[model samples]
Target: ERIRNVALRSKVCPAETASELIKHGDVVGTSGFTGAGYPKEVPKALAQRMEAAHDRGEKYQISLITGASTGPQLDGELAKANGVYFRSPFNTDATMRNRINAGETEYFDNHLGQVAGRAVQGNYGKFNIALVEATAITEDGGIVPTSSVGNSQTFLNLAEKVIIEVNEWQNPMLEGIHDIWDGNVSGVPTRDIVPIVRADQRVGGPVLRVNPDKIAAIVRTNDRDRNAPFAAPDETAKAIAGYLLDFFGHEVKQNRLPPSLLPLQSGVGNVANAVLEGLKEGPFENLVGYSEVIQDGMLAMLDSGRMRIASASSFSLSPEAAEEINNRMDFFRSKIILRQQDVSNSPGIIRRLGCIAMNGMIEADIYGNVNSTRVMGSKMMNGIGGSGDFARSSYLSIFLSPSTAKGGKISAIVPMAAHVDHIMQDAQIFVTEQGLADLRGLSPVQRAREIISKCAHPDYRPMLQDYFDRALKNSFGKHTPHLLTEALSWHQRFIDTGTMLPSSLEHHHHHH
Candidate 1:
């Protein structure tokens, strides 16, 4: 009844009713980062309206911003409407990926920590409304968050009008878990050092306190997020993981790393999970993770007593793990702490901690330039997310991916990446199913040789070697040897012939 009264104070309406109030051309901020705490009904309602408008030959589009990526409703459904004029930060939807790749959507991939700060600074244009998903509304109308506390505080603070989705399906026990601090955007002389040394530190409040007068409507919802279980690590991932374990062992052997290594920051995916799982079996002990999201493997690592502490912004867990988490909440709760994205993915904090960043990439060139976002220079995969956040700042940044995609028709190793997300200067380690290439302290020519010899698939090695041989013959002795004319020829070949290899070299066999 108390919660009901709070809803009544605002103009409580259906999601569609509140969504109808959003105007075209409005810049909107939404609560969600990596598929958690995203406003469900409102975005769905808005997508439906946009679809209806599109059917009527009327165009309605809005600039959208989120903590990182919303789920299928916002990215898949809304993308079908073609209503996203401008989007920022990140997304992982295939539908949205196609659109962004086709140039239908204008996209900017920023650091996850920087998005909220930029929005607060009026960097992404005018902020009109904020759609937030909350577990409960306080008596004074403060929003208690659900699974993720991503950018909600900043969105609420900057929003001219606010719409809250009080999600009933989310556990009310989520109330006291969030630690939110709405950093100042206006008139702050300097930034304070966030006093957090351990994963269990409490740096902020449990709720987002906002002006009740700005609460335009409160909509009730029971929608649950898509909690897809991660695929079992395939041979390729295991091999990559194996090599990574060996590399970490070698690092410790060389006294370049501690026994526990620096605080680990892993990207979200099966490969990243496999590495952590590998760490469980490896020599590392009492490890720590300061990452963007914690997945099931990370939980297992904690349970196995391999990782002592994990600090992340959200839990990207499987259903079984999530359920287990709920049942063993108290046991797992103390081992992990969730913070705001800014704090978790901050470059300063990441560098300060000397985090060992392990992230996945679409492809990497022999020169060590990594393409984490794009497919063929134009096709968007997912936005950069925290890849750049950790890649550029981490003490040792490692990129992991299969050496091939599309059933070996494509080579993940190219002469030069179609797009560069992690430049050669920032990437210290590159790993694939074939092997690992340590690019640290190596020149570009030396890096290329190491990448080709150690990282490229067996089938693609000769072709890459041929390219390198040619480039060296013609363009060698330059700072970074490259035949610019043939640099992106592999990508173009794939575009034209559906294979990365040229007709002549495509069938050539190389003995490993």
Candidate 2:
């Protein structure tokens, strides 16, 4: 019944039969964002085919690109079969991460917003096929999107053949939630200002347009995306939430931010979830979210009418949030507008809207540079992601994490970050469970002082202070005051002994 087009229904076949259209060396672009709106049945069927083929000592691999990271069904199932040759944009699956880290597969980690342009630029070669999950197919072959718009519109435009999965499990009310704008890279034209300044503005149409002749197969399935659950806020995240909220209060006091604040951009993490929960229960009202994903807290905020409107590419919600929103899609969709990532994570759009960019960081150097992507210096965690899109352009930018990691043996506050993703000027606030350091308008030495006293863990403060004190005297550049040779000593210590602190100092800190 969801597929209203009788003509397209004739193309409907089992997922196994449709999987035959995909062959090895095919570069497949898929529909998904965070964990929502992914093709659940076709990928499962494709994974099965890959597994059986591999069992017969046959090579089966395809280049996989998505809106962002998908859930287990697409990533885990395919990865478990050892079936992926290349992956792109973003991912969160452990099996996929292992493959990426071990160099078994080439992961072209990229910014979500630029993915569509990259594909059309012939950077990833030709997109052989597109696998898109849809709520319904219209009489004119308009593909009504499900939970997320993602890159499907772009995928639909680029691929020679399209495999559309009409997912009956998706609530039919989800039909009108999307704003699928043409990315327009198929043939370059004179560009405009993107024309979206408000959070809830809808510039595009409801369904993705595709050439009906290019519709290779249509599959029908009913399945739910098992997105990862957000854990209850732990003590660290709670304290971080408290500090960040208080900072907002201070900004409001100083007239830098209004009571409603500005459009907010939050990255996906437990800390971000706690911050959202704080907003749900906090004093801020009539807020706007122009971030990458809509999480559980965002839905609750929309439900309470506190969040006036939210615009994002995907609903990165837990199972609880997904079901609740699904049940009330008709109501929630009015307050939520799902756009393509090009629009959702657009730097120009974000700058015009003046978003309050808040993201979680892996570690930060004393001089206010942040390392969000890599651990130590070499190991990639996730790509820079949308945090890069928002931080440099937002009215206010913040990076937060606990003061330490790995049982407090390694400090998130380091003399120098082994890697730098966000430069000192891009991020203004460095916050930890310990405290917040506002680095804006401060010199490097002054930022160092504030970061050390305010953000560093108490146990590491003395060591950091000593390093700074010595650096001021011994360093070549007194303005930043870093002993260049000793800058990475903490990270090297961790690599050598599995702890940043020496045994003597580690035991000494343990005494306290």
Candidate 3:
């Protein structure tokens, strides 16, 4: 029933048989973002085949590409069997995380918004095959993407052969929720303007078009997305949301923001949860979102009609919300429009919409440099995803984090970020449970003072204040003061001694 076309329906085969078409060193692209709309069965079957090959004393591995972090079935299973040598764009599976850290898998951590364009530009070499998940096939043989439309369009356009997984588990009602605007029109190496003036605007067709002859195989699957539940909003999360809401309210009063606010782009976390929850409970309505992933928090807002429309590349939802969306696809379909990653994270449209971008970070320095994807400057922590896309281009880019980590042993507000993903130029605002600091046009020293005073934890305030003071008096220039040795001493100390704390300051770790 899922396969509607006669020619494509004849290509339907078991996942095991279909996976054989893939061979050693193949560059395979997949449709997925954080586990949504990923090929479940074939990826698992491919992993099993690799294991079987390994048992026969043979080595085989493929270079993998996907929209972003697919769940255990794809990332975990393949990485467990050592079936992939290279992975690009993003990944968050524990086994894959281990391999990437251990240098077993070569990971090209990239900005989510740029992956598709780069792939089509021949940056990652040629894509041999593309694996896509779908709810159904059209009568005219077009593919109906389910829940998410990630880089599926690009994969279909670029890959020589295509494999479709028509998942019966997905509600067929998903057919109408997509806006499949392909950038690669005119059969050339050029692009077109993403004609999305409004967040709810439709710019393309619902079905993805690919030649029927290009669809090498069709594997049927009936499985649910990981649909992991998020932690409930805590007191700290509530406090952070409260600060952001107050800021928005003040902005509206100052005529800096409209009464309904601009289209929102929020990253996933308790803070995002609390922010959406706050909106659901507030006097806000007619809201539109231009974010990367749609979560349970956003769904609740959509369900309440507080959010008039939402658009994203992927649906990162809880099991509860997932079920609710499936059951109410008729109600939610028009309310949510799924697009490819390139379009969802488009800087042109995001800037055109003037989106309010909110994302979480690992750390930030006093001068407002944000490190969203690194730990101690050497390790990776869930690559920069679409954060950089939204951060650099949106009207108001806000970064959020708890004030401290490791039970106050390490401050999220640091003297210097060991790695800088969002430079001080793009990083406009910093928010923590402690407070918020606006760095819209502040100079170096001025920005430092604001971040230290407004965003830093009380535990590390004096320490950061002392560092700034000394650097101000003795550094080479006052333009951007930096005591070269001490600027990185915090990270150095953490690496050498396992904590960023000085010996004497360890006693100040009192519970809040």
Candidate 4:
């Protein structure tokens, strides 16, 4: 009855309702990050409209904004139709990445916490409409967000019109768990400090407040969010995890870190998940996490009694893991706190909390400049997401990746990164399957030796050594030595020869 009163009376389909609400060139805000709690019907309808427009020899593009990455329907389908004119914050769809890197979509890779802040500041254009997915609408007209409480609050705050997608598949038990804190991003002099002293503390209200007058339509959905299963740690991932554990042990032995370490923030990826999985049997006890997303690997740590509590903005769990969480919702509800991304990833909070941030990287140069996006300097990977948020502010910023990719045909270590996303200054440590490099207080020359020897693959070690030797001898800058002329020679070589190694010496290299 509520659905009929607010959305439909068995007259029009959800697609027609969405088509009526959305317009061309409008700045559209959505609620989702890492494939959870995103609008399903509206964006799909918008994409269909864009495709139909193209068939008629026309273009229909809109500036798209989201909490982070949404489902493939919003990203893959819309991007294929060239429907996204501008995008921000983060995404993981291959189609979107291709378009963003191909100079078709104007994309801004930014801090996840800053999306809502920028929208409030008019930096991301005036927010026109919001397509938010909700588990339920309360009697007071408040919207209860589904699996993730990403940027929904901010989108609702800035939106001129609101369309709520009531998802039937989302458990009603998820309603009271959300702690929505719409803290002022405008830097008011009297802004109250967020009193989140503990990870499990509830700091805000249960639902997102909105004016009932602005509710244009309510769509119903029975679709489930995409389920990403936790993959078993491969050999390379296991090795990296081992090295990280050893590093943690070393830091504890040196009294550089406490026995419990700081609140951990792991990035999203196979390597990150593997590291969390490894912590189940690690030496540390009573660990905690202050992160963006909580994946299945964290559940292992929690179930093992290794981790005490986890504070995150969202849940991105595998189907099996989600089922476990659903069965013991109250159990997890006690150990986990789901807050808004702005609060969870706030640099102010992250620095004060002293998080140990572990993130994955695409590659790193000898000088410690890390590229988390962009492949071979030009192709776009997923946007940086919250890696920079934690890396720049955390007490220990660590980046992880294997030493090589494509079965050793591509080396992860380069003379100079094709593009620099995280600079050397922000990164204190670098980890690969080979080993870890503690880069604190190390100069560029020192970093070059430590990184190449400790982290680079054996096949690339000789080439990296050769580059460093030539640079030290030929380059003049003493602070960080570099041969500017051949800085990107490896990348160029890969482009030309299909391998980073030169063609003449292919026979001389030993097979690992």
Candidate 5:
């Protein structure tokens, strides 16, 4: 029998499969964080069922809800097959995009916390079911969540029925890696974490104890490791760090967001992670982080006594940092809050606390627009994650990248981004390995000039300027958009193998 058909050998009845539980209009909640920690098989079953329902022309518009984009999970397939209704804070897909652009469903762009907040409010009713993935269960049955917790905890707690996919492959003996604490505390949010793992690697609780009575199914599967790390930031990223420090103190200056109090909200990749590392060498104090992932520099800051508070939904750190936290949970527990994604990334809370969110962008046009989700203009690459939620809400929002890519074939600073996720007008700062563009308080014309001169790759500067100059000369208005497709250079295809794009446009394409 095929791998998919192996389920027939199990003792569980036909109702054991996820497809059997999902009705035509049920609001299906999925588990994932960007492209990480997702329930591996259940979504595929739901997709198959939705497709069959649509083929028969029966009513099959089930609303889709997920903590974050599941990276081409069931939403896209359901949208295509069953005419699904979906609402998420951020997503990257043509099927969903086309439907939204064509006004087919109510797609709401939201903060990470809003999804959880709304779900708890019952504005969306009790989650019909929460399909989750985990590494193992303690002797007492508490879940050992995968690296990217995203919204899994809340989903499990809220769902009327729960199905957990447990994979024993994820270092089942790995202990002290997670610490769960309370959200609210007096005199600035402090809580004692009841550890899930002791330093000695003994299981603390049974897997079923997390919600003993509610768990409907505990299916075992192979590890679905979310390939966490991407390329590391090099010389270019270091230069971008220099620009960010300068911009903070002078250009887009805000006294409240001092260099020392530059609380960070960095995304889960190495580039943004590198920026946090750069901060350790700089003179920053009383540093706090309200982010999803607290990486290497963050740990150093916490240890060096410069940082006091580091609140987040999950911790995705460098291996060294992970070891330290796991080994010394007692030392870090009082300073951290392992809360739900909503409280950790809520717009209201971020605005109230005044955080400086730093995230990595895939590409940025000369005007400061960002495209982090789409690859080559049309393919989905691990959805927008929490970058949008944090960037939009933070006090000092900063997006970072290297100047040129693909051996200089592709310049991130282009005339137009193939797809605009965050419009240039909404951005306050842009940093590239080349330099920084401080667009704060600048008119559109001023922003254009500064971005091209400072942030665009050195080789692409002349061509970009020429385009700007010619467009202005031909009465292309003060803000004429550059040709996006025409900007690809021969060496642009090197992004996959190297840190930068190719020097020639030989392999560049619009992002998806």
Candidate 6:
């Protein structure tokens, strides 16, 4: 009776745990990214089982690796299951917050570039299973993954088994749209850059034999079809289009850019897709892209004759966009590139092509720091996807966020950002509803003044600037409110609300 009550009071496991499919000491890799486009269910199952064990005082240690934050489904569930969690980018939602802050989870924060290079360097644990979501499996058995393939394919190659969740709602005919620049051994030339996988009579099914014996499970699930939020071609996005045409250079801005660049890396959503719609009416010409997910705007770019070649890891969009593209796959194939995540975001190749990365972020600090993963502080909006990898490495790194976020409660042009997914040195330009902040060749002081005066919300600048002044006057040299230790956490709180230091500011002098 005592034991029964104890079990009820403590953690409870789910019927299906990772332990069921994975062995006692197996390494499990998850397919996730920064916030959007990750598998949600299997991780939940794995977490449930881990929770059950925690109640019984049983321990299971499975090495975990993921491209980005997979989901809270796995992180929280695993805590109750295994009593501990280990990860790289553990900055997600409430579950990851409590667990990590309490030191229940062991973390190794690595950049996106490190994930792929390390995988090849034997730094990754032996991958046992790869659970990925696919929008379509060509009749020929090729797989199409959803938004932002950070490092899933590398795991698949190393894994002993592969579990593919095929969501038919993703257009089967909407295939052949991707152009990737694959990585290679130091001096070797990597081919198969623009992969052309289509559903046809030859492959004869949804699953194929990329490596025949490793195909583990093919689950036909309807859970993968997620709709993009907001209406298309909103006025705000159209304004961005007008700005780019009027402002962006006729040349690729950087000399390293490919002469006739591939299709652009278009993110999935109303804003990014809407901006792409505006590009359809722009003066830019002879563009092509090798992207992750092909959004509605990308399609419009192709039809406008601006894009000659297009490539993407997945074709995800509204039903209308999907059907229209499906009817014209022949045109898509002529200009699309489809490949795995490792091939797409590899640093070595990205630089060579002189790619220009343009992705959205939640906020930016006055010093030019950017955050796309964590909300103001502890909450997780979505897991960080390939944004860091692309934005950091692209010759032209552009991060866009509104001048403010969440209906103007928080200013995107912060005194200092809460999270540091993108460092100050890496970011080149920032665009907001207010305007663009070009940070090339600017000092921290210069950047801060520019951000606060121009980009920050009108209400917040005076206070932020005041803190900056007091921090400077204190003689300690560290910024006043942006203390190093609570730097990220406080920024999150501020963004969560509209305040400064939530805790005492005594430790402000810890870092120079």
lDDT of 1 by residue, 1-512 (tens): 32534444557889899998788888899888778778889989999999899899988988888888888877888898898998888988778877788788899998888887788678988788988888887766668887787787888888889998888887776776777765542214477776666655777877887788888888888988767677688899899999999988998999999998989888766687688788888888999888888788888988988989888888787788888777777777678777788888888888888888888889988888999887899877888898888999999989899999999999999888999988888898989999999887898989999999999998898988887877778884666778888889889989998988656534532222
How well is each residue in 227-306 modelled by candidate 2, as lDDT tens digits? 67776889999999999999998888898889899999887767998899888888778999999888888888898988
Please, what is the TM-score per model? Answer: 0.94, 0.95, 0.96, 0.94, 0.67, 0.69
Best by TM-score: 3
lDDT for 257 (candidate 5): 57
Judged by whole-model lDDT over C-alpha atoms, candidate 5 comes out at: 0.61
Off by over 4 Å in 5: 1-28, 34-65, 69-111, 117-128, 133-149, 157-160, 165-213, 219-231, 249-256, 318-320, 479-512
Q: lDDT per residue, candidate 6, 123-171, as tens digits? A: 7566777766655554444556654355666666678887665555444
Arrange candidates, best TM-score first. Answer: 3, 2, 4, 1, 6, 5
Instruction: Superpose all Cα atoms of candidate 5 onto the true structure and report the RMSD in Å to 1 decimal.
Output: 9.3
Please identify model 3 stretches exceeding 4 Å from their true place.
185-190, 505-512
Task: Kindly report which residue pairs in candidate 3 clash with one another.
Answer: none
Q: How does model 2 fare in lDDT?
A: 0.87
Lowest summed lDDT across 10 adjacent residues in model 5 is found at 197-206
Model 5 TM-score?
A: 0.67
- Give the Å shift of residue 358 in candidate 1: 0.4
Instruction: Please report, in order, the local distance difference test score of every candidate based on alpha carbons.
Output: 0.83, 0.87, 0.87, 0.83, 0.61, 0.57
Model 6 residue 103 CA deviation (Å) reads 7.1
Between prediction 2 and prediction 3, the one with superior TM-score is: 3
The candidate that achieves the highest lDDT relative to the unseen native structure: 3
> Which lDDT tens digits does candidate 5 get at residues 247-338?
65563354655656645677765566566666666656667777776565677778877777676655555455656765766676556554
Clashing pairs in 1: none
Candidate 6: where are CA atoms >4 Å away? 1-19, 23-25, 30-110, 122-124, 132-152, 164-211, 215-223, 230-242, 249-263, 375-384, 467-512
Worst 10 residues of 2 by lDDT: 503-512
**Could you tell me the lDDT of residue 99 within candidate 5?**
71
